[PDB]
Amino acid sequence: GRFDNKVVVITGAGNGMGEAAARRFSAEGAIVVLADWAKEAVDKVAASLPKGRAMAVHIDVSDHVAVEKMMNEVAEKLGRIDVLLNNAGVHVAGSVLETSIDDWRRIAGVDIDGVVFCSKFALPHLLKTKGCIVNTASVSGLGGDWGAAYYCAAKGAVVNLTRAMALDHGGDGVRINSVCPSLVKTNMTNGWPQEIRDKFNERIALGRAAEPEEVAAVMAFLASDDASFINGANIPVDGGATASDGQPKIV
Amino acid sequence: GRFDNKVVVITGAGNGMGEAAARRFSAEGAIVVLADWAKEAVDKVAASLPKGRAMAVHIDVSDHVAVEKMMNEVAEKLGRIDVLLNNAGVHVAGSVLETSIDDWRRIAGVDIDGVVFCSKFALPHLLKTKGCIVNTASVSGLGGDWGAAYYCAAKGAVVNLTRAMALDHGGDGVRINSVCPSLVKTNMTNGWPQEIRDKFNERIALGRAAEPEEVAAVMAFLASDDASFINGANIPVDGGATASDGQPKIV
Amino acid sequence: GRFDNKVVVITGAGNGMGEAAARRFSAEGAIVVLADWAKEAVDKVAASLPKGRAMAVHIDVSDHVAVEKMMNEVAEKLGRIDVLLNNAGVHVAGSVLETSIDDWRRIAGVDIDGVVFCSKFALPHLLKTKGCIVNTASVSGLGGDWGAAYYCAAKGAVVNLTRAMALDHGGDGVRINSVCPSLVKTNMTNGWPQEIRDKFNERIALGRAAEPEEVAAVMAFLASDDASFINGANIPVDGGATASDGQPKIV
Amino acid sequence: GRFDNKVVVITGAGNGMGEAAARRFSAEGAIVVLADWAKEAVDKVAASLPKGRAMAVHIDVSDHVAVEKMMNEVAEKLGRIDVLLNNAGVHVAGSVLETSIDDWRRIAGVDIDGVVFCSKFALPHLLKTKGCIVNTASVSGLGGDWGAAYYCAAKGAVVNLTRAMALDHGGDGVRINSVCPSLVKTNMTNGWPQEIRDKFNERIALGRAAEPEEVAAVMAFLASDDASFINGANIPVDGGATASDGQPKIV
Ligand SMILES: NC(=O)c1ccc[n+]([C@@H]2O[C@H](COP(=O)([O-])OP(=O)(O)OC[C@H]3O[C@@H](n4cnc5c(N)ncnc54)[C@H](O)[C@@H]3O)[C@@H](O)[C@H]2O)c1
Ligand SMILES: NC(=O)c1ccc[n+]([C@@H]2O[C@H](COP(=O)([O-])OP(=O)(O)OC[C@H]3O[C@@H](n4cnc5c(N)ncnc54)[C@H](O)[C@@H]3O)[C@@H](O)[C@H]2O)c1
Ligand SMILES: NC(=O)c1ccc[n+]([C@@H]2O[C@H](COP(=O)([O-])OP(=O)(O)OC[C@H]3O[C@@H](n4cnc5c(N)ncnc54)[C@H](O)[C@@H]3O)[C@@H](O)[C@H]2O)c1
Ligand SMILES: NC(=O)c1ccc[n+]([C@@H]2O[C@H](COP(=O)([O-])OP(=O)(O)OC[C@H]3O[C@@H](n4cnc5c(N)ncnc54)[C@H](O)[C@@H]3O)[C@@H](O)[C@H]2O)c1
Ligand SMILES: Nc1ncnc2c1ncn2[C@@H]1O[C@H](COP(=O)(O)OP(=O)(O)O)[C@@H](O)[C@H]1O
Ligand SMILES: Nc1ncnc2c1ncn2[C@@H]1O[C@H](COP(=O)(O)OP(=O)(O)O)[C@@H](O)[C@H]1O
Questions:
Q1: b/e for B19-46, b at 16 or more Cβ within 10 A?
Q2: How does pH shape activity (chains A, B, C, D)?
């Protein structure tokens, strides 16, 4: 019962890590708000969890007015917010020469503005509960990739905003951390050519992709009392990916 | 002259480190495009430099339409672009709880969008000259501050965009690097109280604020042949600030 | 019990975070080997734990002959090794100009050699259990201090040895990670003056020193199944210390 | 004449980067001490440089008594030391399971003790000239490699000792920085199988190995007045290697 009666708001709750986060927190006694643009996935997850202990909601995290209303209505209806998981995301592939101003606006709106807005509007509620924030960043926020320029800029914004907010609020009893996953098994990635999955298994020392549960576990730890002295941290959940200096594996 | 007949585009060239960069590159033979939204300031710097070797451009770098036009106009008139200094920036002080959505739009528009747009629209021209980009990020992009949340997110994006674009374009002969200053003596920090400045002399092991010329020296180095194997680097120009683990002096 | 019948070897187990780790793992069902060169201290901790579930080993971990023997003796008697906590450490204060070659030999022998030897001689046993290593490094290994030069070099080695061994062994089912505390309330720092401790409450955003139990909590997490995809990570347990760019508070 | 009449002591002066460093500094007016275990290479380089402006000397940098005598004799004979280049090195290949205690002693003696000892004994001389230190670290000190455990520990010690010493001495006017090269063209590496050199050209965005001159250039910059505000920095000279989060290049 690590999260007994704690109110956990999950943005991007309809993706693999979002759903694994929702089930892990629920299993540990949390009341879970599954917030997402899309309705089907979060409605199905919410319906699968204990009645009265899960609600699905529509949100555009790129919309600060909608975000502010969502955060106040959750606090009004459930009386508290204890945990924010900023798990919404969009990915676009390409260099800045292969990706449009529009692509940049899309990445920035969800991957940066979403973290800024949901953290700003949850914080007054988190300050009352001495709750915490866990951002879903990425190894792509700790270092660059080939062919994901906008994505790397945005997750780099999330990684450093995590540090800055942690300094601003940690002394008022609200810890702010991120998880920085590498390759996570979804149907997107299960479908990838074998040649591509092999290149990931070579660069990742554990030699496999993460299960979404393996990332949700770290999110749950970082929201737990055991993480009482972890603040402003960007935890690589990457089987060793970012532990390399970038030099090739030779035997 | 290290920069003899090289076209150097410098955003935020009307003041501080941009101005110091304009004088240093001009002294070393560069033709300098001075871009700024402070029309009088940038006109004065432009006019102070050798006739026919400097042109002022009145531009808000947050405007992708204006930026695209400037980069193509410069290329047409001067026949080339060798160096982009993404130096234009604005600061705002406070946590996300003390700074408005409008403060965020101002920070993100100049400090992220301006870097993204100027990089994107210069790059086709830099690919022809095998030129380079030097972003002015900040130590505020390599880690967090207390009370500059939006600025830290923005410079966070600049730091990781520097890495990603370096991976994308280095193989095509275009190096992308940043300088990451700590306290520099400019209009951006001239209002900051004495007790904060005194704490900077403690946290910076060199025991003083930087002169703008000291950062312009590193921008010139990073645009030089001597930096031919430096790519995707965020060079701290901070007198040791980021070298510290954040702990106070042990003795 | 998360660690039911797991053999956990803990260096520096007679005091501070090693002791707290011994109690936490023991509480969670571990059989604990308590290694220390403080024979009375480690005997007292060992004797305080459940009978037949703890053994004290009087060892100087800087001694590769003694370390090789302990690791093989433990494996013989207990039939397995599941977890190594490389926690033993000594501190010395000063620049290289104020600390002797003998100070360096003491720092390097315990703080680097001891980690290297214990890791090397445990690893054949951890490969059989698909166990893990948790190094106790320091924020003093992720960046510099004023006046702990030798200690910073040593913890520097621990941090990057953690990354390299993670790449070497993660694919064989052995995860290698560190915890990087800042100020923790132990014998190592109990002599440090009040003015320095007060500065720590400023530089640590949580505004307090860590309890040893708060670091032992993260060691237990990193040795747990919930850390199944964390490998080669240097987890800061520093209340935000390393999240800062080193600058003093901006407001 | 950037280094006119400045006394530059280069350890490891007989290797590719050592010789390129010696020629670059000499070209800029330096008086160069070429210090190395081996005699032939440094004698030949010294004999090739202006008479009265270069001397070759034997040193074991693993020997603190010999190092201390060398530093005092250079200061006695030439009257000053302005620059230390800590460029001595030994590499060993393998995990900790493939490399002996002896291998560790060899790596630690030259790659750590050499930097500690030469910096300790030069410093009193550098404090009189407000000179500087440039450590030859490695990307292998900024992150791990597969199959170089001891090497990664040692260069990780050099990277963090650089930070610590920079904090200790930068306020007394002695800046301390490192260069962190990746693959550098030598005959060792020119001879490598094409399959291995291809894997380096893939991970390095510039798509090639560094010339030793490209690393020497960065050493010369970091010792120059242009680097007046760079202190405690570990400059990647790696064509982008460490700019990657470790994820594979996919197209
Ligand atoms: N001063 C410091 O201590 C410090 C520290 C770290 C980094 N920086 C960065 O250094 C860069 C230069 O700032 P500075 O300290 O020289 O300040 P400054 O005020 O002296 O100069 C900044 C210049 O940028 C221009 N500018 C701002 N927004 C613009 C826009 N939208 N379009 C065009 N021009 C614009 C301003 O008019 C001004 O001339 C910024 O990116 C800043 O964030 C400053
Ligand atoms: N949207 C825009 O077009 C826009 C927005 C911001 C500012 N600007 C331009 O910036 C310029 C200044 O406007 P502002 O409101 O930012 O300015 P301001 O009056 O706030 O002054 C800007 C900075 O200059 C410093 N300063 C004052 N006197 C100075 C002097 N003699 N020399 C150098 N620095 C001096 C101030 O202390 C301050 O740090 C104008 O040209 C304005 O058009 C453009
Ligand atoms: N206390 C802090 O603020 C702090 C901060 C960061 C990291 N650390 C690290 O935490 C670890 C634990 O230290 P602590 O703070 O719990 O101190 P402590 O003094 O409470 O415990 C350290 C223990 O290690 C033992 N030890 C030392 N050298 C040994 C050797 N050669 N062989 C065997 N045992 C040996 C000591 O006898 C002692 O029991 C160390 O590696 C230390 O560097 C301490
Ligand atoms: N070469 C070796 O074998 C070696 C070297 C160092 C110490 N040790 C062992 O460490 C132990 C202590 O020796 P030392 O000289 O390091 O000790 P010490 O007298 O310096 O005390 C060690 C630490 O314990 C603290 N302390 C004092 N009273 C305490 C108490 N009642 N409970 C808990 N902590 C207390 C002290 O303030 C100090 O921080 C001995 O068992 C000694 O054999 C081993
Ligand atoms: N504007 C938005 N507001 C709220 N949630 C959003 C928004 N944009 C994307 N999301 C959600 O973020 C989650 C993560 O997106 P993504 O990383 O693309 O997941 P997946 O790869 O599994 O499709 C999704 O559930 C998606 O619907
Ligand atoms: N104990 C030592 N004292 C002084 N110089 C040393 C010592 N050990 C190695 N060196 C020198 O360090 C330099 C760099 O070594 P290394 O990296 O192996 O160079 P290379 O790969 O070109 O042979 C060499 O010139 C070598 O002789």
A1: bbbbbbbbebebbbbbbbbeeebbeebb
A2: Optimum pH is 8.0 for meso-2,3-butanediol oxidation. Optimum pH is 5.0 for (3S/3R)-acetoin reduction and 8.0 for diacetyl reduction.
